Amino acid sequence: IKKFQSVSLLEEYLRSSPYVMDQDELDLHRAIVALSEKMKAVDDNASKKK
Amino acid sequence: KWTSAAVVTPPEPVQWQELEKTFTKLRVLDLDIKIDRTEAFNLFIKKFQSVSLLEEYLRSSPYVMDQDELDLHRAIVALSEKMKAVDDNASKKKDEPSLYTSWTLSFTAPTSEEAQTVLSGYIDYISALVVKESIENVRNKLEIKTQFEKEKLAQDRIKMKNQLDANIQRLNYSLDIANAAGIKKPVYKDDPDFSISLGADGIERKLEIEKAVTDVAELNGELRNRQYLVEQLTKANINDVNFTPFKYQLSPSLP
């Protein structure tokens, strides 16, 4: 979970993904930043009375 | 106008392995010390938040000095107001624990490039400060350990020459008593104050022997081994080891 939540690992992953580099300048960076914001990880037990 | 950001957490065991090797050498020499991984992180945070350290970083940075008299100071004070550090778990308070610690470091600038080069630069600068002081502490602990053992040995040697000299006197008296009592050969019990069961012949020889003793370590292996220990502490040293006192979750962004 810690490594998941890491934006930089995530960015490294997207950039390194054949699949992702299909969907072209340094607008690239913005796109990555945009994709990265759509990964979520949430504790199911946080959003309930502890 | 452009805020660059970084998110940092305490460093991880894999980053600490050169450090761990060094602590191992010392552990063999009876010196049990670590650099706690969370304490090094906190020290990084404290240091990061030091305004005097920040001003010093700025003044010393050729990059910053490109951007003109005693407004220099004012520009610095103004720039320094745009480094922030926030604990991510202060906002949204207690009752909801934090799996991991984590802070957000940031710098806001006129340009995108400026904010990122200055957050990295400052981070690396503070990081080096943590590394330098942390090795210093380790070296200091070694210094004290060495001072202590070296000094205690000197003392122990004098304490034993004393004990040995007291024994020589006692042995002299054992010799008179044995002679008076006519015990020449060993007895075939003993007085608790002046042992004589050895006999005068044997005592005489034991007496020349104890009187010819110079270095008390000759018959004492615990002293030889303490001498050895001090030689080893004196020869041991702590190498300039490099480490990072945090793990990035987000390394400084390009806004």
Q: What are phi and psi of A27, to 5 degrees?
A: -70, -25
Using H for helix, E for strand and C for coil, what is the string for chain B? CEEEEEEEECCCHHHHHHHHHHHHHHHHCCCCCCCCHHHHHHHHHHHHCCHHHHHHHHHCCHHHHHCCCCHHHHHHHHHHCCEEEEECCCCCCCCCCCCCCCEEEEEEECCHHHHHHHHHHHHHHHHHHHHHHHHHHHHHHHHHHHHHHHHHHHHHHHHHHHHHHHHHHHHHHHHHHHHHHCCCCCCCCCCCCCCCCCCHHHHHHHHHHHHCCCCHHHHCHHHHHHHHHHHHHHHCCCCCCCCCCCEEEECCCCC
Cβ atoms of B55 and B80 closer than 8 Å: yes
Resolution for this experimental structure (Å): 2.7
Inform me whether the C-beta atom of residue A26 falls under 8 Å from chain B C-beta atoms: no
Sequence-ordered list of residues with C-beta below 8 angstroms from that of A28, at least 6 positions apart, any chain:
none
Inform me whether the C-beta atom of residue B12 falls under 8 Å from chain A C-beta atoms: no
Residue of A nearest to B99 (CA): A2
Task: Report the distance separating Cα A25 and Cα B151, nearest Å.
Answer: 69
Residue type, B183: I
Between the two ends of chain A, the Cα-to-Cα distance in Å is: 20
CA–CA distances in Å: residue B172 to residues B30, B163, B188, B233 = 41, 14, 22, 40
Residue of A nearest to B252 (CA): A8
Count the neighbouring beta carbons within 10 Å of the beta carbon of residue B148.
12
Residue type, B81: E
Phi-psi region of A46 (alpha: psi -120 to 50; beta: other; left: phi over 0): alpha
The domains of chain B, with CATH numbers, are 1-137+243-255 (3.30.1890.10), 138-242 (1.10.287.210)
Among residues B138, B106, B142, B139, which one has the least CA distance to residue B39? B138
Task: Report the distance separating Cα B194 and Cα B203, nearest Å.
Answer: 11
Chain A residues with CB-CB distance to B250 below 8 A = 6-8
Q: How many angstroms separate the most distant Cα atoms in chain B?
A: 106
Task: Report the distance separating Cα A25 and Cα A20, nearest Å.
Answer: 15
Inform me whether the C-beta atom of residue A23 falls under 8 Å from chain B C-beta atoms: no
User: Which residues does residue B9 pair with via DSSP β-bridges, in sequence order?
Assistant: B247
Sequence-ordered list of residues with C-beta below 8 angstroms from that of B98, at least 6 positions apart, any chain:
B88, B89
Inform me whether the C-beta atom of residue B120 falls under 8 Å from chain A C-beta atoms: no
CB-CB under 8 Å, B249 with A6:
yes
Among residues B14, B13, B38, B34, which one has the least CA distance to residue B101? B38
> Please, which experimental method was used?
X-ray
Sequence-ordered list of residues with C-beta below 8 angstroms from that of B174, at least 6 positions apart, any chain:
B194, B195, B196, B198, B203
Task: Report the distance separating Cα A39 and Cα A11, nearest Å.
Answer: 11
Q: How many angstroms separate the most distant Cα atoms in chain A?
A: 47
Nearest-CB residue to B99 (from A1, A7, A50) = A1
Among residues B84, B121, B117, which one has the least CA distance to residue B103? B84
Write out the H or E segment, with its range, that includes residue A11: helix A7-15
Task: Report the distance separating Cα B194 and Cα B47, nearest Å.
Answer: 67
Among residues B15, B8, B234, B236, which one has the least CA distance to residue B120? B8
* DSSP β-ladder status, B103-109 and B247-250: unpaired
User: Which residues does residue B105 pair with via DSSP β-bridges, in sequence order?
Assistant: B6, B85
Sequence-ordered list of residues with C-beta below 8 angstroms from that of B246, at least 6 positions apart, any chain:
B8, B9, B10, B11, B41, B44, B127
- Identify the residue whose tokens are 């020349």: B208
Half-sphere exposure of B170 (CA within 13 A, CB side): 12
CB-CB under 8 Å, B100 with A29:
no
Inform me whether the C-beta atom of residue A5 falls under 8 Å from chain B C-beta atoms: yes
Spatial strand order in the sheet of B83-87: B83-87, B103-109, B2-9, B247-250
Nearest-CB residue to A7 (from B99, B100, B249) = B249
Burial of residue B57 (CB within 10 Å: 0-12, 13-18, 19+) is buried
Sequence-ordered list of residues with C-beta below 8 angstroms from that of B179, at least 6 positions apart, any chain:
B200
Cβ atoms of B15 and B244 closer than 8 Å: yes
Task: Report the distance separating Cα B28 and Cα A9, nearest Å.
Answer: 39
CA–CA distances in Å: residue B240 to residues B38, B43, B57, B139, B208 = 21, 19, 22, 10, 53
CA–CA distances in Å: residue B192 to residues B70, B216, B230 = 87, 25, 38
Task: Report the distance separating Cα B197 and Cα B188, nearest Å.
Answer: 8
Half-sphere exposure of B163 (CA within 13 A, CB side): 8
Chain A residues with CB-CB distance to B100 below 8 A = 2
* DSSP one-letter code for A8: H
